[PDB]
Structure formats: C-alpha cells, structure tokens
Amino acid sequence: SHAAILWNEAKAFIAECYAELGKAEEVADRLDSIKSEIDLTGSYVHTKEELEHGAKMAWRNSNRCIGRLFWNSLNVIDRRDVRTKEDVRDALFHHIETATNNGKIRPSITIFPPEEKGEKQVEIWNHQLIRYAGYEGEAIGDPASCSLTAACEQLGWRGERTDFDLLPLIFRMKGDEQPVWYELPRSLVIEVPITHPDIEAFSDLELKWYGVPIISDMKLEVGGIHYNAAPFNGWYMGTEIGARNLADEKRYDKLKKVASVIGISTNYNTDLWKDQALVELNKAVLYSYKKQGVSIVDHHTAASQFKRFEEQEEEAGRKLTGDWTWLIPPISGSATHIFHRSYDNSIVKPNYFYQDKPYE
Amino acid sequence: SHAAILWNEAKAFIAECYAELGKAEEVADRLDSIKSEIDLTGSYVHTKEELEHGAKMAWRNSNRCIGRLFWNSLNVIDRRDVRTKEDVRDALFHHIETATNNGKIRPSITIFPPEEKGEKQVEIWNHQLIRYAGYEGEAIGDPASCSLTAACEQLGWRGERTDFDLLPLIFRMKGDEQPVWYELPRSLVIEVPITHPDIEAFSDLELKWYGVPIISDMKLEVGGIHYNAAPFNGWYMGTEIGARNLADEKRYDKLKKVASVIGISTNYNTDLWKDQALVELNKAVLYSYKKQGVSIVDHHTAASQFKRFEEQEEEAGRKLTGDWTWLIPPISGSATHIFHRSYDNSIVKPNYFYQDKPYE
Numbered sequence: 001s002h003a004a005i006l007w008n009e010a011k012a013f014i015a016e017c018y019a020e021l022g023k024a025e026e027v028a029d030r031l032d033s034i035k036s037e038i039d040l041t042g043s044y045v046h047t048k049e050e051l052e053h054g055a056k057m058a059w060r061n062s063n064r065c066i067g068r069l070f071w072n073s074l075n076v077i078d079r080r081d082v083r084t085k086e087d088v089r090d091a092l093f094h095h096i097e098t099a100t101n102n103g104k105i106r107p108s109i110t111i112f113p114p115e116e117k118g119e120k121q122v123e124i125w126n127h128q129l130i131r132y133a134g135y136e137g138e139a140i141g142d143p144a145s146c147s148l149t150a151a152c153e154q155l156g157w158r159g160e161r162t163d164f165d166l167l168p169l170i171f172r173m174k175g176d177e178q179p180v181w182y183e184l185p186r187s188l189v190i191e192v193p194i195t196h197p198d199i200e201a202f203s204d205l206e207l208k209w210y211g212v213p214i215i216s217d218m219k220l221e222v223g224g225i226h227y228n229a230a231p232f233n234g235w236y237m238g239t240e241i242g243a244r245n246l247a248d249e250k251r252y253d254k255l256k257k258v259a260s261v262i263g264i265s266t267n268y269n270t271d272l273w274k275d276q277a278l279v280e281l282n283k284a285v286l287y288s289y290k291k292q293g294v295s296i297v298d299h300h301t302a303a304s305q306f307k308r309f310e311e312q313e314e315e316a317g318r319k320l321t322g323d324w325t326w327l328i329p330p331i332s333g334s335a336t337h338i339f340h341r342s343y344d345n346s347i348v349k350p351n352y353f354y355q356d357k358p359y360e
Numbered sequence: 361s362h363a364a365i366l367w368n369e370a371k372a373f374i375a376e377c378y379a380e381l382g383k384a385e386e387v388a389d390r391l392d393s394i395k396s397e398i399d400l401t402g403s404y405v406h407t408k409e410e411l412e413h414g415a416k417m418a419w420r421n422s423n424r425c426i427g428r429l430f431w432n433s434l435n436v437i438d439r440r441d442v443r444t445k446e447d448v449r450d451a452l453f454h455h456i457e458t459a460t461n462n463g464k465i466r467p468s469i470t471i472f473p474p475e476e477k478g479e480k481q482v483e484i485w486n487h488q489l490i491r492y493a494g495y496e497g498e499a500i501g502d503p504a505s506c507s508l509t510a511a512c513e514q515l516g517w518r519g520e521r522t523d524f525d526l527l528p529l530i531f532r533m534k535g536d537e538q539p540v541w542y543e544l545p546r547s548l549v550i551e552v553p554i555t556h557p558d559i560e561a562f563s564d565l566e567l568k569w570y571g572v573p574i575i576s577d578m579k580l581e582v583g584g585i586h587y588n589a590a591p592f593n594g595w596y597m598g599t600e601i602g603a604r605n606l607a608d609e610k611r612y613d614k615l616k617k618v619a620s621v622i623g624i625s626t627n628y629n630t631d632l633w634k635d636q637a638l639v640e641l642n643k644a645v646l647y648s649y650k651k652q653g654v655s656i657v658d659h660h661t662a663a664s665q666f667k668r669f670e671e672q673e674e675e676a677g678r679k680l681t682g683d684w685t686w687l688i689p690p691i692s693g694s695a696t697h698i699f700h701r702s703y704d705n706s707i708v709k710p711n712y713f714y715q716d717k718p719y720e
C-alpha cells in the first residue's frame with residue numbers, strides 16, 4: 001500500500017506543481033517516468049525544480065506560520081548528495097552561514113536525502129540548529145532543552161553550565177546505532193545581547209538570544225516523499241523571544257526580574273506589571289536585534305504582511321488555511337486583523353509535520 | 361418530533377439535576393408528572409429549584425466564560441409571572457438595580473417566560489440591558505450598536521448623538537407586531553469615567569463605560585425548555601473594556617489618542633506603542649472602576665480563578681469544556697495558564713445560545 005499512496009500523492013503534486021510553474025504539458029510524460037521509477041526502484045527522485053517549489057509550497061501551506069508572504073523567496077539548498085557525517089556537518093555549518101548572512105537573514109532550507117524504505121538516511125536530533133542547553137537542580141538555561149541536553153551528555157558532550165550553553169549539532173547516519181555530535185564554532189553563531197533604548201539598567205539582566213531560528217526536527221513531505229531531514233529558517237518575530245522564550249514561566253521566566261529593573265512593583269495584578277514587563281521586554285528585543293543589524297520583525301508588521309498574503313492567495317485562486325490559535329501574537333492579540341477573523345485549519349500537502357523524537 | 365426531543369432533554373436534565381442536588385429518589389416521580397404534562401399541555405413547568413440550578417449549570421457549561429468559578433453563587437430571579445410590558449420593564453429595571461448593588465455587582469439572572477409552541481412570550485431586542493448607541497456620517501458612539509440604534513429610531517426613539525447615548529430598553533410582548541421601548545432612568549445606571557493613577561492628562565480623553573455588562577440576547581435552554589428571555593450578568597474583566605470595547609478599530613478605537621496622551625510616538629510599529637497604549641489603557645480601567653467601588657477583575661486574577669475552577673470540576677468528576685479562542689485575554693495571552701493548555705469545545709446542555717436578531 002506504500003507503493004500505492006506514493007503514486008497518488010505524486011499524481012496530485014506533479015500536476016499542481018507544474019500548473020503553478022506553467023508546465024502543464026510536461027505532466028503526462030513526467031508521471032509516466034515516475035510510474036516506471038516506483039516499480040523499478042520502489043520510489044522516485046524529484047528534480048531540482050520540483051523539490052525547490054515543493055519546499056516553497058510546503059511553506060505556503062504551513063498553517064502556523066505568520067510569515068508566509070515570502071514563501072516564494074525561500075532559498076532552497078539541495079544537499080541530497082551528502083554521504084558522510086562530514087558532508088552533513090559541513091552542510092549544516094553552511095546553512096547557518098548562508099542563512100545568517102551577516103544579519104540580513106535569508107529564509108533558507110537544506111534538503112537532505114529522504115527516507116528510503118521508510119528508513120532514514122540522515123536523522124537530525126536538534127530541535128533547532130542553534131538552541132541553548134537546559135539543565136536541573138535549580139533551573140539553569142532553557143528548560144525546553146532538558147531532554148536533549150541529557151541525550152547529548154549521554155554521548156560525551158559536556159556543557160559549561162551557563163544559562164546560554166550552545167548545544168552541539170547532533171545527528172545519526174543510516175547504518176550507525178548511535179548519533180554523533182559536533183560543537184558549533186562560536187564565529188558562526190550570531191547572538192544579540194538584549195538592551196533597552198531608554199532604560200540603561202536593562203543590561204543588568206544580562207539577557208541574550210541567538211539570531212537565527214533554524215527548525216531542524218520536522219519532516220517535509222512533498223508528493224509521497226518524506227524528507228525527515230530538511231532544516232528550514234526564517235527570521236524571528238520579536239514576541240517569539242520576548243514573550244515566549246524569555247517570559248514563559250516554563251522557559252527563562254524573566255518577567256519579575258524585568259519588572260524589577262523597570263522600576264515597577266510586582267505587588268498587585270491590577271497594576272498589570274506583567275503586561276508592562278512584557279511590552280518593555282519586547283521593545284528591548286526589537287531594538288537590540290535592529291541595533292545590531294540582525295533581521296527581526298514585530299508582530300504588527302508581521303500581521304500586516306500576513307494580511308497581504310491572505311489577499312495574494314485569494315488573487316491566485318488558492319484557498320487559505322491557517323491555525324488561529326498559533327497565528328495570533330501572544331502579545332496584544334486583538335490589535336491585529338488576525339484576531340478578528342477565522343481560519344480554516346486543514347492539512348494540505350506539501351507541508352511540514354512533526355515527527356517522533358529519537359531521544360526521550 | 362418536538363414533543364419527543366423535549367422529553368429526551370427533560371430526562372437527561374432532571375436526572376443530572378437531582379443527582380447534583382442529592383435527590384435521586386425523586387427522579388422517577390417527577391419524570392412521570394412531566395410525561396403527563398407534555399401530553400396534557402404539550403410542555404412542562406420547572407420548579408423554582410430546578411430552574412435555579414438549571415441556570416447555574418448553564419453557566420458552568422459556558423465554554424467562553426472565564427469567570428465560571430462563581431457559577432453556584434448565581435442569583436436567580438424568577439419572573440415567569442410577568443404578563444405586561446409594565447411587568448417586564450419593572451423586572452428589567454430591577455435586574456439592573458439588584459445586579460448593580462451600589463458597585464458590589466451581583467452575578468444575576470432574570471428568568472422570563474419561555475417559548476410555548478416555539479412562539480416567544482417576551483422578546484428582548486437589546487444586546488445588553490445597558491449599552492451605548494452607535495451612529496454614522498463619521499463614527500459617533502459604539503459602531504457595534506449601529507443596527508439596533510436605527511431600529512430604535514424607526515420606533516420613535518432619538519439620541520442626543522453623543523459618543524455615550526444610553527439606548528432604551530426595547531422588547532416585544534407576544535401578540536404585538538412591533539416592540540415597545542423605554543428610556544433608562546439615569547439614576548439606575550452606573551458609569552465610570554476613566555482616569556489614570558500616574559498620568560493626570562488621561563482625563564482629556566473623556567472616556568467612560570457603564571458598570572454592568574448584562575447580556576440580554578441569548579436563549580437559556582434547560583432540558584428542552586427554551587428561555588429566549590433570560591438576561592444574565594457577571595462583573596467586567598478589565599480587558600473587555602480596555603482592549604476590546606475602547607481599543608478595537610471597529611469599536612471606539614482610542615489607541616492612538618491614548619498613545620498621544622501618554623507622551624509616546626505612533627511613528628513606528630517597532631516601538632510597540634499600540635501595546636504600550638493597551639497596557640496603560642487597561643491599568644486605567646482597572647483603577648477607575650476600583651476607585652469608584654464598582655466590581656471588576658483583571659485578566660490574571662480571572663485566569664487564576666478559572667484555574668481553580670478547572671480543578672473543582674475535576675474534583676467533582678465533571679468533564680471540563682471550554683473555547684480556547686475565547687478564553688485567553690486579548691492582552692498578554694501567553695502570561696496565563698489558559699494559553700498553555702488545550703480545551704474541549706463541546707456543547708453541553710443546559711447552556712446559553714445565540715439566537716437570530718429581530719432587527720437587521
């Protein structure tokens with residue numbers, strides 16, 4: 001049945017793919033070659049073109065992404081040729097460098113070899129290429145990274161135990177029972193120390209965050225083909241860091257410390273200090289990144305841009321899908337157009353899906 | 361089939377009602393009397409007790425209400441005896457007085473006669489007993505009240521055309537083709553002029569809001585019986601006014617004027633002035649109402665209290681239902697526990713439902 005499903009997805013994708021590319025005549029011929037290939041080998045190989053667009057389509061269909069407007073500008077890096085851990089490491093190191101782009105982040109994606117007989121050719125363990133390690137006795141670092149950190153320590157890695165230890169790249173090549181790790185070169189990673197434009201004391205918090213959010217634990221499904229290893233990246237949206245990463249109680253939880261440095265009390269809820277702390281924290285984030293020349297975007301510009309997206313999909317005769325619960329910024333939800341409209345949360349392929357974590 | 365549905369709902373309700381009241385033995389007897397009554401007349405009459413609890417249960421099952429913790433403290437006022445427009449008017453005037461309670465608002469509900477043969481005995485037009493009128497040329501008042509305002513003007517009512525004109529009570533008695541209106545006595549309505557604790561200039565905005573949000577356009581369904589007229593009220597939650605009523609672009613839209621008086625620019629989104637304006641506006645709301653002795657609650661205390669609710673339903677063996685999209689405050693969603701947990705948005709009776717508006 002796996003040989004049946006693949007064919008079906010393949011039919012829909014190729015057709016839809018070529019129609020968008022304006023190559024409807026080449027659909028019959030290609031589908032025939034694909035049919036033979038699924039018999040001959042048991043699967044098929046996308047063309048640099050198909051795969052590139054397949055990855056862009058997958059972005060456009062990512063219900064939870066608010067930055068979908070730049071879907072067609074995605075820079076696809078095809079690394080389906082990698083055979084060794086050295087090839088993967090270099091590939092990954094390159095993704096970070098090319099994406100980072102000295103601050104002018106480039107929404108990129110490295111396409112690693114897909115699953116063969118349901119077996120993985122490359123298996124990336126990291127949630128994000130760049131991510132901070134988390135530990136416990138009392139909370140040190142990113143709690144969200146507890147599980148993986150221990151998995152890395154079980155393989156010989158050891159962190160200096162600071163709140164911002166950079167986890168190493170960790171993956172497993174087909175044929176190997178365990179994965180291998182590689183420490184990240186400090187010169188490749190851009191970090192941004194957080195400061196405030198009007199409050200000079202904000203630096204006493206000694207906060208900071210990496211510049212590029214490269215999600216590496218998701219499977220890109222493009223027409224029956226499963227690319228479990230396909231790291232992608234956009235640029236950050238202020239709130240992701242100021243509201244979730246740093247303010248969540250289960251994350252860095254700096255709201256109280258922040259409220260303290262802004263000279264406000266934490267006595268009563270009715271003073272809405274948490275809210276005030278959140279705003280000030282997010283002004284700091286947007287200002288820091290910008291001062292350093294690293295790309296970031298605020299939730300309003302992001303909502304504004306997403307609205308343009310909604311209009312362009314319409315103008316192209318494409319139904320729009322989205323997850324309301326994930327699309328509204330965790331800060332001032334009702335101040336954006338997204339809060340006042342409903343969305344169709346339906347799955348459409350190609351897309352990006354979660355997958356069972358190797359550790360844990 | 362209407363005589364069949366009624367019986368079925370009735371069975372489930374009585375059982376579930378008496379089990380909660382600890383009167384399981386009286387279920388058989390009551391159900392028999394109810395059966396005869398549905399044959400004899402075509403429907404049945406709840407006891408003061410049944411109806412009271414039925415209305416409290418309906419609150420507990422209101423997926424969108426964050427203040428469900430005080431569900432069992434609801435003050436039910438049974439006015440199923442009203443026969444005239446004078447009886448309704450007085451009933452309504454009383455609900456406002458008893459609910460208002462000089463600022464110490466009382467979560468109340470007036471139970472008006474239910475629908476007979478699907479026909480309404482009393483039909484309230486107002487969205488809320490107390491609500492501001494809205495007009496157009498340029499926006500004057502509450503835009504959300506445009507439709508109803510015109511409906512009132514078509515019946516002889518005329519507003520002074522200020523941003524806060526109090527709409528009259530408007531309803532229709534069975535037998536009458538058109539509804540009748542009654543102006544609200546200024547002494548009955550409590551209003552709260554908005555001011556800021558640290559910013560003395562906030563009063564130049566000349567903002568204000570009524571004290572009690574009495575929702576009057578919803579049908580209370582309790583065991584097959586439809587009470588289309590059953591005005592209910594709780595107390596406000598700061599955000600309802602500061603974030604939605606006053607800040608929504610489609611409502612009063614005062615964010616820019618607010619940002620102006622707090623001495624901040626509206627030049628760039630990256631300064632997050634909207635967010636800052638929202639917070640300051642909500643601090644003003646909570647502070648105003650409190651300074652005047654009128655009950656209100658902030659979104660944190662509200663989330664905190666709702667969490668206690670979640671635990672008590674559990675401790676009582678009752679499945680919890682809720683609408684995530686409506687439960688999270690439009691201000692700092694991710695700072696409350698509600699943002700980090702999912703809810704089962706399933707309909708459970710008794711409950712409150714929307715109904716087609718008479719005007720429009």
Ligand code: HEM
Pocket residue numbers: 055058059062064065066067068070074107108109232233234235236237240297302352
């Ligand atoms: C160009 C910049 C982009 C911006 C402003 C942006 C922003 C966002 C934000 C705000 C989220 C929510 C993340 C969270 O709450 O954890 C999100 C999720 C997501 N984005 Fe984007 N994104 C961008 C680029 C990308 C790229 C390049 C891809 C794919 C090629 C993409 C794929 C996705 C997917 C599938 C999710 C869901 C992630 C998850 O559920 O964990 N985004 N996006």
Ligand code: HEM
Pocket residue numbers: 415418419422424425426427428430434467468469592593594595596597600657662712
């Ligand atoms: C004791 C104070 C209460 C608080 C803090 C409270 C708060 C809330 C809030 C914040 C909303 C959202 C309203 C909106 O966004 O438009 C809501 C909705 C609702 N509440 Fe409550 N409430 C209270 C009392 C009540 C009472 C007394 C009842 C019924 C007896 C109730 C029934 C409902 C219903 C059905 C809705 C949905 C309204 C709609 O969808 O338009 N609430 N509640």
Ligand SMILES: C[C@H](O)[C@H](O)[C@H]1CNc2nc(N)[nH]c(=O)c2N1
Pocket residue numbers: 325326327699700701702
């Ligand atoms: C599942 C999780 O606890 C929560 O419900 C959601 C909702 N909204 C979100 N929205 C975004 N953008 N990102 C998130 O992590 C979440 N988490």
Ligand SMILES: C[C@H](O)[C@H](O)[C@H]1CNc2nc(N)[nH]c(=O)c2N1
Pocket residue numbers: 339340341342685686687
């Ligand atoms: C239907 C409406 O436009 C919007 O989607 C919702 C969502 N969340 C809400 N939440 C609350 N509490 N109240 C509301 O009016 C709404 N409106």
Ligand SMILES: NC(=[NH2+])NCCC[C@H](N)C(=O)O
Pocket residue numbers: 128213215233234235236237240241245
């Ligand atoms: N802008 C993006 N592409 N975001 C992807 C998710 C990043 C994730 N929220 C983080 O905080 O690291």
Ligand SMILES: NC(=[NH2+])NCCC[C@H](N)C(=O)O
Pocket residue numbers: 488573575593594595596597600601605
């Ligand atoms: N606390 C309540 N019971 N709210 C009911 C809804 C009130 C409505 N949101 C208003 O702004 O008038």
